[PDB]
Design a protein around this ligand. Structure first.
Ligand SMILES: CN1CCN(c2ccccc2CO)CC1
Ligand SMILES: CN1CCN(c2ccccc2CO)CC1
Length: 147
């Protein structure tokens, strides 16, 4: 029916059908368009107090809750989708990953290298697609597949 991970859903507030991907947590009004040895991704990570290492170049001690991290992620996603902000700009400024210095770029990778939820979302994204919030032991990720 639909590409890997996609399902139809019903908007509570509008009643319009939309599409949701349960691997990437992407959601969109438009019917989804649709695996390689490698993908290239950028990401914006927001850590929280239960992250594997609650510390980053932005904050020596990361004290925000997972719920607070998710709200930050949601707000970055809204600004990226509205065009108010670019993914690369937000990642450079606010990602708790050191890859912030590279506009969030992680370079290219294969299956078996990244944390599994990150890997699964990365490989379910089409080139140029962005995920919704993806949870790993590092925190909450916005993933952009660039290659
Ligand atoms: C020593 N720390 C900074 C340099 N490290 C790095 C930088 C760029 C590419 C890959 C790596 C390591 O996988 C992260 C750890
Ligand atoms: C686990 N990852 C190691 C390599 N990462 C990094 C850091 C700085 C510049 C570029 C990169 C990678 O493109 C950090 C996270």
């Amino acid at each position: 029916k639909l590409p890997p991970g996609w399902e139809k859903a019903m908007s509570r507030s509008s009643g319009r059908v939309y599409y949701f991907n349960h691997i990437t947590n992407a959601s969109q009004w438009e019917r989804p368009s649709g695996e390689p040895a490698r993908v290239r991704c950028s990401h914006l990570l927001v850590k929280h107090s239960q992250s594997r290492r609650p510390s980053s170049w932005r904050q020596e001690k990361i004290t925000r809750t997972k719920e607070e991290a998710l709200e930050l992620i949601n707000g970055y996603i809204q600004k990226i989708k509205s065009g108010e902000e670019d993914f690369e700009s937000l990642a450079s400024q606010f990602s708790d990953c050191s890859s912030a210095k590279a506009r969030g770029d992680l370079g290219a990778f294969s299956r078996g290298q990244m944390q599994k939820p990150f890997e699964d979302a990365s490989f379910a994204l089409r080139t140029g697609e962005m995920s919704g919030p993806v949870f790993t032991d590092s925190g909450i990720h916005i993933i952009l597949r660039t290659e």
